[PDB]
Amino acid sequence: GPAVGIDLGTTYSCVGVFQHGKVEIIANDQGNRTTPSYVAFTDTERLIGDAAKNQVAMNPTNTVFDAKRLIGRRFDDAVVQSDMKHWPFMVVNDAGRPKVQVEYKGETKSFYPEEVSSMVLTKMKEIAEAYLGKTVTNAVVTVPAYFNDSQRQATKDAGTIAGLNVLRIINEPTAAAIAYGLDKKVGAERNVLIFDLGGGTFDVSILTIAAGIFEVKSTAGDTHLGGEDFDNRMVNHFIAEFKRKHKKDISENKRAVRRLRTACERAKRTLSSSTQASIEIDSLYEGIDFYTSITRARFEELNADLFRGTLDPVEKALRDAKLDKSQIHDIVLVGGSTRIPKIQKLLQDFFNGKELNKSINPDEAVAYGAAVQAAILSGDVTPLSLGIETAGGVMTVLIKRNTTIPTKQTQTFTTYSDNQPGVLIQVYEGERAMTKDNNLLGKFELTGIPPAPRGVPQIEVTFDIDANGILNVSAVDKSTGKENKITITNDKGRLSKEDIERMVQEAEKYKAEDEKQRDKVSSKNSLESYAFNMKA
């Protein structure tokens, strides 16, 4: 019995299976392909999914949602603290941990965000078990690419509590790229931008995919922007439209506002395929019927700042990834709000007409990729960057990873100390900033350098890779022609596919700490005489 991929989203969750060469997204008991991430508690029962979201108006103090916003955080976290000012349900400080507090069958009960989300995994489990007719245990579950090891572990804990064996935790932008098979496209490396706009969150992620390996170069977004905000703009417009045409403010009637919000979400769906949408609400306030219309143009005007604003996280991420928008090879639309025609055009205009990858249901694509990965775990170019130690144990790359073979690349270095007699050349493998966090391939001395002031001697290191993967590293003293070389054996299978992933992921986890370290040294390709990692 195969494994499942689950997208445990902030507001909605989704479950997929790869069975007999096809990925199927599994509907819930009420026929929905997506289930609200809501756990409602009452005097009698525990509600999960649609029935919990459906009773929110009756039991808002005991209905929990947005548990992804607490999961793996301190109670004192600024996001936690401010986020509470919008949640009808109670959050409390147990030993510096958030715990949502709720009344369940007369008694008061407290749950950790892992437990809340575990109940959502329990529902997705049962939904797949009803579809598949068999117990499901093995599952891949996705997380936002910006999640820290504490939030990934918390998510895994929710799955384990749920009775799930979590085969692996993968980033939502990577699953989305998997879904679209971007890792099976030939050619050099590829940069992918994932534009993910859900009901409540916005995430932009830039990835590079070469030889089936994914590195997340950058993440930007807005954790408090989503389709609900667009609905909110519609709601306020119509409330003022009612006040202007009926001299009545409906907002102090709670049921009246809800019915309006519900009308507005419907029309926003219509305005993705039509240029106009109707509002037909009987007896909305004080017996007045509200029958009116909103054009897509008026809808776009109400969300002009919000729609154009999404290009800023797009620009930040291209910046942080040190890429020009001309260097993106694929754009993936993810999230149901990416169906909004204006969102699509903005992004497409910003990318000079580039087509958008959007043929998979953007609500489903993350679970779909997560299902491709579950079945995989269930049943050329250089692998790593190559470089030498410069002053400070710093990694100075000469052959970037994913570079085609055979290649030859050369750089000129200099001495760090005055009258340096020699440089010790130390070849390294890896994507970390410091050589100590990388793999030492070989060492050799270049000696007999004519004494001079620091930065005057010229040392030309060349990296040469034939087509068998035989790396050859040589240094020439430019003032005399003296040279030395090392030949590095290409051991077949020395690194597994998963070995490369661990190195790439460590550079992803510490990219910031590595960033600052690269900045601190001013060597600019100076070479010392000793191994930096062996000095007292």
Ligand SMILES: O=C(O)c1cncc(-n2cccc2)c1
């Ligand atoms: O979630 C949204 O913002 C959204 C916007 N436009 C259209 C849809 N839509 C249409 C058919 C199924 C979903 C959803």
Ligand SMILES: [K+]
């Ligand atoms: K997820």
